[PDB]
């Protein structure tokens, strides 16, 4: 259903340095053997200064629907979270609750610690068996 033309999705890659990241994209077409999906990124560009959004043909395994958006005023310590960083969604864990509705999130591969506001975060959900799953 999320494969249908024009439907908004999120896509990932397994090229090293990309595993764990989800970028927002829109479906352009799909195979009706291949089972591939043609997509256009929303914030990623083809190259350089960039006027053309990047297009890509990915296996259906690397495509999922966009997770439902929630009203979120606060996250708790050790909450598993998605952070919107460098135009991509990165999964990490809240390791410190800061003041002014801000949070420290710890990431791995490579190990890192970043500061985020509440608006840059959402709950981490994996898309498994046609269902959204929290850890």
């Amino acid at each position: 259903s999320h494969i249908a033309k024009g439907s908004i999705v999120e896509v990932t890659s397994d090229e090293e340095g990309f595993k764990g990241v989800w970028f927002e994209a829109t479906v352009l077409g799909a195979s009706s053997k291949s089972k591939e999906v043609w997509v256009e990124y929303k914030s990623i560009v083809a190259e350089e200064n960039g006027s053309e959004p990047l297009k890509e043909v990915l296996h259906v395994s690397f495509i999922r629907p966009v997770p439902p958006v929630e009203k979120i005023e606060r996250f708790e310590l050790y909450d598993v979270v998605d952070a919107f960083h460098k135009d991509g969604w990165w999964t990490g864990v809240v390791t410190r609750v800061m003041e002014d509705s801000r949070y420290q999130v710890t990431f791995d591969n490579p190990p890192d610690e970043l500061e985020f506001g509440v608006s840059e975060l959402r709950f981490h959900q994996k898309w498994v068996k046609g269902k959204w799953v929290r850890p």
Binding site: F18, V21, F23, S43, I44, V45, G50, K86, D87, P110
Partner: peptide, 10 residues
Amino acid sequence: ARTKQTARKS
């Protein structure tokens, strides 16, 4: 607003 490689980490 960025190429795919300036989105990658390190």
